[PDB]
Structure 1
Amino acid sequence: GLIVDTRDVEERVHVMRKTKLAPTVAHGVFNPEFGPAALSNKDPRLNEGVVLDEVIFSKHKGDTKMSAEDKALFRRCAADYASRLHSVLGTANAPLSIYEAIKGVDGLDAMEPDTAPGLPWALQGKRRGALIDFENGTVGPEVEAALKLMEKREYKFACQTFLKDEIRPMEKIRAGKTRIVDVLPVEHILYTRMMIGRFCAQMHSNNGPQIGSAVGCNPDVDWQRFGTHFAQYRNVWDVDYSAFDANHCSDAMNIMFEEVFRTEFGFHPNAEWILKTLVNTEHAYENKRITVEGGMPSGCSATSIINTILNNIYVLYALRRHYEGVELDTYTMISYGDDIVVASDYDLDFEALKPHFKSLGQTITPADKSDKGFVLGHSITDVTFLKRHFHMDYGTGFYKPVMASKTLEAILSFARRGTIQEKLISVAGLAVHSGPDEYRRLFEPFQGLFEIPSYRSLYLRWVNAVCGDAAAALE
């Protein structure tokens, strides 16, 4: 995005600044090239003469401005993708009730308590539970005040910038490339789910290539569905972006909101409005008041979906801007926010597309980062998606989501105090696809210390999960 105003205020919005991630016994055994993010300017492990607060905002390199022709083209791609999208999902996008927005529906999880509620409930020492009733599905005084202020299209807000306390590669840590979360007010989040929560629900349960979205998928069972789809195509590309979230330009955002969330598709008129309030935002990080034009706030509750929608339009736009007669069936794809797999029987040159993507302020890059650029002939078994490869299971003949063993080591090395046991069982479900020998090795350090699920129990669980027929095809 484009920063238009840095300014200082003495009501400090303080951030966290040390990690919750204590090492585990796995740490000493594996010695991973990973560790907690850098949360303090004083962090020893940070390269000398690097201040945490500046590199944070180096992602805002400008808000790309598009020509009248490129905008008309983008609008067509947005309208075409929107056409596909609503054709699959239907047009029953009437506002969710407050109860339904709090508690969720089929396809949409309930809103969370115990997480941040944003501003200025941080400035009033007010906690999520104090504003809304999560079991009752009801709201309090000022949030209802703020609710019917957004009806009236007035709503003053700022984003609260947090530092993401997470495991990162040791280099990102010495470089101080700590990721950030923009926590919006809880009234913003719930209203957004009132405006578009029914649509998001439909997206989740209809995830797949046809809508180009994996948001709400279950990789354990859906890898078979996705893998077999992309195996049918002659070319498969693993496309990476540089700072996808931050580089959504004002023109692309506004136009996608205008084309996707129209009232003719059964949205309330305020769906477009509430989404449009994410374009020019207000970030109370570090020295509080920083104003940004362009880019998507990293974290809203519809971020994954919005980043997915834009990703789908970006690809259509880039291809149409280089080739002629490019339509939605010219290629296939699936994405999850910035993460994307593309495939086609056409021999599309993603190296030539680079500038066309750059007209949107987006920089595409091959996943390898080697060769010299995008090559052809790659298949579904060469790519990473949701940090998972596609591999064939020997026993079933299904695709399984395999994670890099060194990534699993990193995840197994650090954990919050008192959660290790739960985290192991959780991570066991991920590691089971790495095969029995590597599974045994990854969980060696916890032998006789924590309960470790047997490889066989999770394999049988997974087999039935992929489809009961396979599990029943035995015995």
Structure 2
Amino acid sequence: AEIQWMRPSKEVGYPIINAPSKTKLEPSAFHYVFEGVKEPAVLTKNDPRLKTDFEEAIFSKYVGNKITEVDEYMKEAVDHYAGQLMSLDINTEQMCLEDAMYGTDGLEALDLSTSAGYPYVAMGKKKRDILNKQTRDTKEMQKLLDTYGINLPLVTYVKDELRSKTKVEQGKSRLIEASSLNDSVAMRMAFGNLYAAFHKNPGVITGSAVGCDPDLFWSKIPVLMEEKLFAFDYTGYDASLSPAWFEALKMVLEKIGFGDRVDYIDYLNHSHHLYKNKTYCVKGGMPSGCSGTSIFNSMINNLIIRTLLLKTYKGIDLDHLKMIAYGDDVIASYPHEVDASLLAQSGKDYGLTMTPADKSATFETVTWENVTFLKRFFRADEKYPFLIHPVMPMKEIHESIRWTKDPRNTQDHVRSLCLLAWHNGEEEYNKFLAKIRSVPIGRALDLPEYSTLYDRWLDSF
């Protein structure tokens, strides 16, 4: 993606946006009980750890667009994917403001904790001041729509999250481009049924994993995959999507019944931003905080993988391409072996930066033994092999448990980690519970034992 221009918000009539400067993260009761190397990302220029201009580093993700034209391959990719989706019979109807707000089957209600973006972020108005979960009141929202309309600037914040030492010293913090509650609502009405259809059909038909429950879904993946697996990582996926990938996305939407509101896709692609006191225009790239971001990123990944295969392996049978994406992350397969390294080359022509799966030195064969999806490995249950365990590495869990954003959610944070950890084995799990219980805070938590989680799991199928 590329910033077209940038200048003082006041110059163009926009109020300054004040974003916190102090991280809400801090050592937790288990900070010294477990090993960890990650710490809060840099949130301001005045951060002792910085080793380069912050402002300069957070915007270094923008380096241009290598392409701006949907070629022949991309068009064929569009047709094949669009064709697959056609078989789901996605409801092309628009979603009523009520369901678009408080949810329906296939779509959760709006996240009240997340920013309501402009103009409500400099208007001091929050989300609970516009909707009530038990009321189902559209009235307020409706007036707000009619008043400010849509296509409002995206409020840009630095993301408060753990980052390695390096990325802290190089001010490599990630940015949250929050959308106005107005747009988010419009888009859920425009694509609401598309979203639901995807959430209800994680797999190789939607080629999506969004909405999935790893505890159950992991056992279905091997059955959906073809003989030979292949994968790779992306560097700066969102920012790397050229405008052409958005046009191809629109072509797909048009072909499945949504040519109706494809303009919305233009706002994702060519976006208007508000960061601090400045305002800027971005051409290309996916914004991190818009309605559907996850789903559209996955749809585009399906288009991407297909395109690179058509350009590298003419005559390939896409109908035997079995892949599942979740944003940039993907697990794919084909009846025959393919060269990820080659594919990584073709992708470079399309602006994509593909590298060896899970930071490997080079492109090695991908197997059920080493493949990962959503950071989770795949391990057959030692007693009932047909049941597959999604195995998140302890290191991730250790890193995460060493901090906290609110003592009141400690019970939940630790419980959640437990639902991830036990898949590593009873031995490992008990060592984990043991260390948690080696401090006062831990001992006061209500945590599930191994046999309890293993039995619940077996019955859930």
TM-score relative to the length of structure 1: 0.89
Aligned twin of 1:450 = 445
Structure 2 counterpart of 1:57, from 56, 59, 81: 59
Per-residue deviation, 1:464 = 1.2
In the alignment, does 2:93 pair up with 1:97? no
When residues 122 and 335 of structure 1 are mapped into structure 2, their CA distance, relative to the original with a 3 A threshold, is: same
Equivalent pair of 2:229/2:337 in contact (CA under 8 Å): no
In the alignment, does 2:395 pair up with 1:406? yes
Q: Secondary structure at the match of 2:447?
A: coil
C-alpha distance in 1, partners of 2:65/2:133? 38
Per-residue deviation, 1:121 = 0.6
Structure 2 counterpart of 1:265, from 247, 256, 259: 256
Paired AA for residue 370 in structure 2: D
Q: Structure 1: where are the runs of 5+ without partners?
A: 468-475
Per-residue deviation, 1:54 = 1.8
Equivalent pair of 2:381/2:389 in contact (CA under 8 Å): yes
Per-residue deviation, 1:280 = 1.0
Aligned twin of 1:471 = none
In the alignment, does 2:153 pair up with 1:165? no
When residues 289 and 342 of structure 1 are mapped into structure 2, their CA distance, relative to the original with a 3 A threshold, is: same
When residues 172 and 443 of structure 1 are mapped into structure 2, their CA distance, relative to the original with a 3 A threshold, is: farther
Percent of counterpart pairs with the same letter?
31
When residues 444 and 436 of structure 1 are mapped into structure 2, their CA distance, relative to the original with a 3 A threshold, is: same
Paired AA for residue 30 in structure 2: A
How many equivalent residue pairs?
450
Aligned twin of 2:341 = 351
Paired AA for residue 287 in structure 2: P
Equivalent pair of 1:94/1:268 in contact (CA under 8 Å): no
Q: Secondary structure at the match of 1:25?
A: coil
Equivalent pair of 1:64/1:359 in contact (CA under 8 Å): yes
Aligned twin of 1:299 = 289
Q: How does 1:106-145 map to 2 (within 5 A)?
A: 106-140=105-139, 143-144=142-143
Aligned twin of 1:6 = 6
Q: Secondary structure at the match of 1:17?
A: coil
C-alpha distance in 1, partners of 2:307/2:370? 25
Per-residue deviation, 1:362 = 0.7
When residues 97 and 293 of structure 1 are mapped into structure 2, their CA distance, relative to the original with a 3 A threshold, is: same
Q: Deviations over 1:125-147 (max 9, x none)?
A: 11112234443333355754635
When residues 371 and 129 of structure 1 are mapped into structure 2, their CA distance, relative to the original with a 3 A threshold, is: closer
Structure 1 counterpart of 2:271, from 244, 265, 281: 281
- Cα RMSD (Å): 2.1
C-alpha distance in 2, partners of 1:418/1:122? 25
Paired AA for residue 78 in structure 1: V
C-alpha distance in 2, partners of 1:16/1:364? 34
Paired AA for residue 123 in structure 1: A
Q: Deviations over 1:344-368 (max 9, x none)?
A: 2212112122232123211111124
Bigger drift between 346-355 and 298-307 goes to 346-355
Aligned twin of 1:25 = 29
Q: How does 1:238-253 map to 2 (within 5 A)?
A: 238-253=231-246
C-alpha distance in 1, partners of 2:276/2:345? 34
C-alpha distance in 1, partners of 2:111/2:384? 37
Q: How does 1:283-432 map to 2 (within 5 A)?
A: 283-372=273-362, 374-376=363-365, 378-397=366-385, 398-416=387-405, 417-432=407-422
C-alpha distance in 2, partners of 1:248/1:295? 5
C-alpha distance in 2, partners of 1:418/1:148? 38
Structure 1 counterpart of 2:247, from 238, 254, 273: 254
Aligned twin of 1:470 = none
C-alpha distance in 2, partners of 1:90/1:32? 47
Aligned twin of 2:440 = none
Q: Deviations over 1:59-85 (max 9, x none)?
A: 111022245xx5243122112201111
C-alpha distance in 2, partners of 1:134/1:260? 34
Equivalent pair of 2:204/2:323 in contact (CA under 8 Å): yes
When residues 168 and 284 of structure 1 are mapped into structure 2, their CA distance, relative to the original with a 3 A threshold, is: same
Paired AA for residue 352 in structure 2: Q
Paired AA for residue 292 in structure 1: V
Q: Deviations over 1:102-139 (max 9, x none)?
A: 12121111112232100011111111122344433333
C-alpha distance in 2, partners of 1:456/1:320? 48
C-alpha distance in 1, partners of 2:159/2:174? 5
Q: Deviations over 1:273-298 (max 9, x none)?
A: 11222111112124420111001111
C-alpha distance in 2, partners of 1:112/1:405? 29
Per-residue deviation, 1:92 = 1.9
Per-residue deviation, 1:229 = 3.4
Consecutive aligned runs of 4 or more in structure 1 exceeding 4 Å deviation: 140-143, 147-150
Bigger drift between 205-214 and 183-192 goes to 205-214
Equivalent pair of 2:42/2:50 in contact (CA under 8 Å): no
Paired AA for residue 131 in structure 1: I
Per-residue deviation, 1:172 = 2.1
Q: How does 1:74-223 map to 2 (within 5 A)?
A: 74-87=74-87, 89-140=88-139, 143-144=142-143, 146=145, 155-223=150-218
Q: Deviations over 1:309-334 (max 9, x none)?
A: 00000011011112212232242111
C-alpha distance in 1, partners of 2:319/2:80? 12
When residues 455 and 237 of structure 1 are mapped into structure 2, their CA distance, relative to the original with a 3 A threshold, is: same
Equivalent pair of 1:8/1:289 in contact (CA under 8 Å): yes
When residues 429 and 133 of structure 1 are mapped into structure 2, their CA distance, relative to the original with a 3 A threshold, is: same
